[PDB]
Amino acid sequence: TEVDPTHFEKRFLKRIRDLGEFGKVELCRYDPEGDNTGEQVAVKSLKPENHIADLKKEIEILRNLYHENIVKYKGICTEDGGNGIKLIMEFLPSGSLKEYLPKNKNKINLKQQLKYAVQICKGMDYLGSRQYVHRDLAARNVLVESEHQVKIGDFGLTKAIETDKEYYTVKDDRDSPVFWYAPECLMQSKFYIASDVWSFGVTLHELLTYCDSDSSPMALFLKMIGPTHGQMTVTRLVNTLKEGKRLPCPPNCPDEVYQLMRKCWEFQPSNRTSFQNLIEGFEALLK
Numbered sequence: 001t002e003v004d005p006t007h008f009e010k011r012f013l014k015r016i017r018d019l020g021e022f023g024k025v026e027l028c029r030y031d032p033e034g035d036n037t038g039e040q041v042a043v044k045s046l047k048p049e050n051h052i053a054d055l056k057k058e059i060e061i062l063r064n065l066y067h068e069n070i071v072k073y074k075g076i077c078t079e080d081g082g083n084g085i086k087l088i089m090e091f092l093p094s095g096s097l098k099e100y101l102p103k104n105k106n107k108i109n110l111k112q113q114l115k116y117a118v119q120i121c122k123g124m125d126y127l128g129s130r131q132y133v134h135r136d137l138a139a140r141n142v143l144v145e146s147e148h149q150v151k152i153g154d155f156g157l158t159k160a161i162e163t164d165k166e167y168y169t170v171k172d173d174r175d176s177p178v179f180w181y182a183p184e185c186l187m188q189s190k191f192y193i194a195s196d197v198w199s200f201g202v203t204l205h206e207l208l209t210y211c212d213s214d215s216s217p218m219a220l221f222l223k224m225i226g227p228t229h230g231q232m233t234v235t236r237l238v239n240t241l242k243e244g245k246r247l248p249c250p251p252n253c254p255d256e257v258y259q260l261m262r263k264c265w266e267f268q269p270s271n272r273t274s275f276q277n278l279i280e281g282f283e284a285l286l287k
């Protein structure tokens with residue numbers, strides 16, 4: 001009778017709090033000894049409110065990503081009856097950039113922010129080179145490993161780009177993070193690697209504003225276009241982008257950093273900078 005270190009029994013999984021939420025992520029303590037000494041893990045499960053194939057594809061994607069800036073897969077939790085699966089990941093106590101940055105503003109300077117930018121680009125470049133589109137790159141999905149290290153922590157919308165194709169055609173777009181989305185995603189429901197570059201520029205803007213809610217891309221775009229357009233919000237967002245309007249320069253952000261951000265926001269995907277170029281650009285500012 002052999003031992004699988006990637007197999008977690010649901011009986012020993014004890015919920016502590018919600019980390020995020022068709023899917024939900026919870027902080028759990030895996031306690032097979034039942035004495036509260038067990039390890040804390042992040043557990044992704046389906047909400048009953050079936051998307052089992054989607055979660056299984058996410059698990060298979062994450063199980064085969066090995067990068068310092070990508071959250072670690074720990075294992076799976078399956079029930080003997082064959083009904084359902086849970087994704088088990090490592091837990092990062094500092095949380096995402098959304099929680100970490102407002103709390104550590106005095107500790108985190110521009111140099112450390114640019115190092116996080118490089119790490120996000122590296123994790124994203126590794127993902128892209130493996131023919132994947134992330135589709136949900138935002139600061140809330142960037143986890144803090146330590147003051148010196150960040151990791152992409154959620155892959156719920158990650159899709160494989162088919163061979164001999166430049167993009168993924170989006171069908172389900174109801175819960176799209178529209179304020180992080182490139183015009184081709186909003187207008188044609190097409191997802192390219194360059195669309196993840198656009199989303200990175202938006203995430204870079206959040207990082208430079210220390211994830212303050214009043215300076216969020218949603219709060220800023222709604223001030224630009226109007227906050228009471230309801231079902232017309234996306235069209236008014238697309239027109240604004242078609243006009244060449246973009247998010248403004250963060251306070252105390254030097255122009256050279258802002259210019260790299262603007263290269264992520266070129267209207268045409270082909271005219272946008274790559275993650276390789278972004279990495280080179282930030283590295284040139286760090287030395």
Ligand SMILES: CS(=O)(=O)NCc1nc2cnc3[nH]ccc3c2n1[C@@H]1C[C@H]2CC[C@@H]1C2
Nearest residue numbers: 019020025042090091092095096099153154
């Ligand atoms: C509100 S909070 O809970 O303060 N911080 C959020 C958080 N913190 C996380 C810590 N470790 C994690 N391991 C895997 C995910 C994960 C964490 N998450 C979330 C679950 C996934 C969707 C948003 C991120 C990633």
